What does this fold into?
Amino acid sequence: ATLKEVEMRLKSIKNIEKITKTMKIVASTRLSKAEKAKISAKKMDEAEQLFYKNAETKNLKELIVAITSDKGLCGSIHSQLAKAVRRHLNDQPNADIVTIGDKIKMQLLRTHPNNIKLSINGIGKDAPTFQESALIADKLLSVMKAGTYPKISIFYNDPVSSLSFEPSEKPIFNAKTIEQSPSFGKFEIDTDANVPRDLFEYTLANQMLTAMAQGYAAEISARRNAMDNASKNAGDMINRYSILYNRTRQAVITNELVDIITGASS
Amino acid sequence: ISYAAYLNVAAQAIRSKTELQTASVLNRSQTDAFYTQYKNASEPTPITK
Amino acid sequence: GEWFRDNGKHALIVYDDLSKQAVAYRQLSLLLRRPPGREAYPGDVFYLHSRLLERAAKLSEKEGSGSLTALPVIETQGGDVSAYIPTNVISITDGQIFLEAELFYKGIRPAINVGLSVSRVGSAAQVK
It folds into this structure.
């Protein structure tokens, strides 16, 4: 009800506004740079998972890896993905969990503290790179012994448009599971040096980079979208408070004048 | 070291002329990711992978 | 209360509340046709309160050692502590206890804003 209050309550929102409006452009510059990594990733995966299609490979304990990031302000990316892991993970309250990005953690940490055995950090900054995808894979083999699992599953957000997305699941097959397939014999693979070992380890890295690249571009599209709605919504409050400001300012001049007036009359 | 991670070292020797070492090359050769094993709740040291 | 103070004893004095006393003084003064000041209060409304509270005091040994502690109460409107009278009294006392409706409803009772509340005498007046 005082000028100071209304003027500074305005100064909080006017920046909130300008800031959310900046990260929509920083989000838009980051948009194309990341639509590009998604294209390069898919294209690589298309050459790799096409072999699994021909071998007609299926699955004869469990590891779940769910991918988002650390940063919020991207709408419901972390939420309805976490929810997709809830829907699927009803069938397996004993599936070990590695999470990529702190937000899917605080989602999955509060719903199932114990399943999370591993958690990755500082992810959604720039676009995902192979190094990330690889060293995360490396540790999934190291302490998580990813090899010694019947079924592996990657969780990530696929971007359908620039307005919506779909939480998706795709499987990972190991050294063993590749061999005992409907059509391993279609290919003249040399059965000498540990090949299925590698094609699994190489795929573990790759199918994640591809999940992250898609999860990233989904996130980046969701940011520019949530921030557009926010900057819009902020301006609205700025408008409503510029009006209250103006009322109060007028009131202040009048009320001050009435004291001078009463004082003058006596 | 593993087949993914091994390849990476030969992808950072391949990565490391300063002139063709464009901006989005140095980026790909870095990472600020910390791995933390989580027991029970939480567990050990977060280490820079 | 001063009698207790002036005779080696101790008295606490609660003024509930000074906001309403300031209003009464204002009524008095306008009807006497004494020209008002800010918000129609008398020009010396600061003095009104300062002389009241200066009287609370811890007397020296040569005077018997009695004391008068004062807990004056002020009512703010809409959380407005910059209002005229609340600003006056804040400048007179040895600290304040700010009570807040928003803290009251979170289930903080007493609804004391710790950040904003000081005791100026401080620890010199606290069982060790």
Strands of chain A lie at 62-67, 96-100, 116-120, 151-159, 165-172. The interface with chain B takes residues 109, 113-114, 116-123, 125-126, 129-139, 141-143, 197-198, 201-202, 204-205 of chain A (CB under 8 Å).
